[PDB]
Coordinates of C-alpha atoms and ligand atoms in Angstrom, one line a residue:
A1 CA 0.0 0.0 0.0
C2 CA 1.0 3.6 -0.4
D3 CA 2.0 5.7 2.6
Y4 CA 1.3 8.7 0.4
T5 CA -0.7 8.9 -2.8
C6 CA -0.3 11.8 -5.1
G7 CA -2.5 11.4 -8.2
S8 CA -1.3 8.1 -9.6
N9 CA 2.1 8.3 -7.9
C10 CA 2.7 6.0 -4.9
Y11 CA 5.2 6.8 -2.2
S12 CA 6.5 5.0 0.9
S13 CA 7.8 6.7 4.0
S14 CA 11.3 5.7 2.8
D15 CA 10.8 7.6 -0.5
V16 CA 9.8 10.7 1.5
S17 CA 12.7 10.5 4.0
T18 CA 15.2 10.2 1.1
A19 CA 13.8 13.2 -0.7
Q20 CA 13.5 15.3 2.5
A21 CA 17.1 14.5 3.4
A22 CA 18.4 15.7 0.0
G23 CA 16.3 18.9 0.1
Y24 CA 17.3 19.7 3.7
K25 CA 21.0 19.3 2.9
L26 CA 20.8 21.9 0.1
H27 CA 18.8 24.2 2.4
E28 CA 21.6 24.1 5.0
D29 CA 24.2 24.9 2.3
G30 CA 22.2 27.7 0.8
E31 CA 22.3 26.0 -2.6
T32 CA 19.5 25.7 -5.1
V33 CA 18.7 23.7 -8.2
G34 CA 16.2 23.9 -11.0
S35 CA 14.4 26.9 -12.6
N36 CA 12.2 27.3 -9.5
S37 CA 15.2 27.3 -7.2
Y38 CA 14.4 24.3 -5.0
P39 CA 14.4 23.9 -2.0
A40 CA 12.0 26.9 -2.2
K41 CA 10.1 28.8 0.6
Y42 CA 6.6 27.5 1.0
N43 CA 4.2 30.1 2.3
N44 CA 1.2 27.7 2.7
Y45 CA -1.3 29.9 0.9
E46 CA -3.5 26.8 0.8
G47 CA -3.7 27.0 4.6
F48 CA -2.9 23.3 5.2
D49 CA -3.1 22.2 8.8
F50 CA 0.5 21.2 9.4
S51 CA 1.4 20.1 12.9
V52 CA 5.0 21.4 12.8
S53 CA 6.0 25.1 12.8
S54 CA 7.0 27.2 9.9
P55 CA 9.0 28.4 8.0
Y56 CA 8.3 25.7 5.5
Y57 CA 10.3 24.7 2.4
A58 CA 9.2 22.6 -0.6
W59 CA 11.4 20.1 -2.4
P60 CA 10.4 17.9 -5.4
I61 CA 9.8 14.1 -4.8
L62 CA 10.0 12.1 -8.0
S63 CA 7.9 9.1 -8.9
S64 CA 10.9 7.6 -10.6
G65 CA 12.5 7.1 -7.2
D66 CA 15.5 9.3 -8.1
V67 CA 16.4 12.3 -6.1
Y68 CA 15.7 15.7 -7.7
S69 CA 18.9 17.3 -9.3
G70 CA 17.4 19.8 -11.6
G71 CA 15.2 19.6 -14.7
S72 CA 11.4 19.0 -14.4
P73 CA 10.3 18.8 -10.8
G74 CA 7.0 17.1 -11.7
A75 CA 3.9 17.7 -9.6
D76 CA 4.8 16.3 -6.2
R77 CA 6.5 18.0 -3.3
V78 CA 7.7 17.1 0.2
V79 CA 7.4 20.0 2.7
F80 CA 9.8 20.3 5.7
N81 CA 10.7 23.0 8.2
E82 CA 13.9 24.6 9.6
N83 CA 14.2 21.7 12.1
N84 CA 14.1 19.1 9.3
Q85 CA 10.7 18.0 10.4
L86 CA 8.2 16.7 7.8
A87 CA 5.2 18.9 7.4
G88 CA 3.5 16.9 4.7
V89 CA 3.5 15.7 1.1
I90 CA 1.5 17.8 -1.5
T91 CA 0.8 17.8 -5.2
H92 CA -0.4 20.0 -8.1
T93 CA -2.3 16.9 -9.4
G94 CA -6.0 17.3 -8.9
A95 CA -5.5 20.9 -7.8
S96 CA -6.8 24.0 -9.6
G97 CA -4.4 26.5 -11.2
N98 CA -1.0 26.5 -9.5
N99 CA -2.5 25.4 -6.2
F100 CA -1.7 22.3 -4.2
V101 CA -3.7 19.6 -2.5
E102 CA -2.4 17.1 0.0
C103 CA -1.5 13.6 -1.0
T104 CA -3.6 11.0 0.8
Ligands
LIG1 N1 0.4 27.1 -4.4 C1 1.4 27.6 -3.7 N2 2.5 28.0 -4.3 C2 3.5 28.5 -3.5 C3 3.4 28.6 -2.1 N3 4.5 29.2 -1.6 C4 5.3 29.4 -2.6 N4 4.8 28.9 -3.8 C5 5.4 28.9 -5.1 O1 4.7 29.8 -6.0 C6 4.5 29.1 -7.3 C7 3.0 29.3 -7.7 O2 2.6 30.6 -7.7 C8 4.8 27.6 -7.0 O3 5.5 27.2 -8.2 P1 5.0 25.9 -9.1 O4 3.6 26.3 -9.5 O5 6.0 25.8 -10.2 O6 5.1 24.8 -8.1 C9 5.6 27.5 -5.7 O7 7.0 27.4 -5.9 C10 2.2 28.2 -1.5 O8 2.0 28.3 -0.3 N5 1.3 27.7 -2.3
LIG2 CA1 9.2 4.0 -4.1

């Protein structure tokens, strides 16, 4: 079963931890990759009910299993905070415009 389901993409907790670790590392080094400069600040316009405190940062999680290194970020993102705590997993899939919805 999927720990997180983003559209047709299935993710396990291990997939999320691996992606989060990569994104947090770049965050601590102040380095960014991709046209959207990930890891990027996530303002939570959607108003998701995250249990951990902000600031939040979004980092792409890929359905291929590989860690994001630039290029197309796809539609899914892992959101983490300054303490390297997981806030949630979100996606543009099934969301209007440039908004996000949570993966179930
Ligand atoms: N939907 C959404 N986009 C945000 C938020 N904070 C920052 N953004 C950024 O703003 C852009 C959308 O206006 C997003 O790019 P993306 O659409 O390429 O993912 C994303 O990087 C937020 O809270 N919600
Ligand atoms: Ca996987």
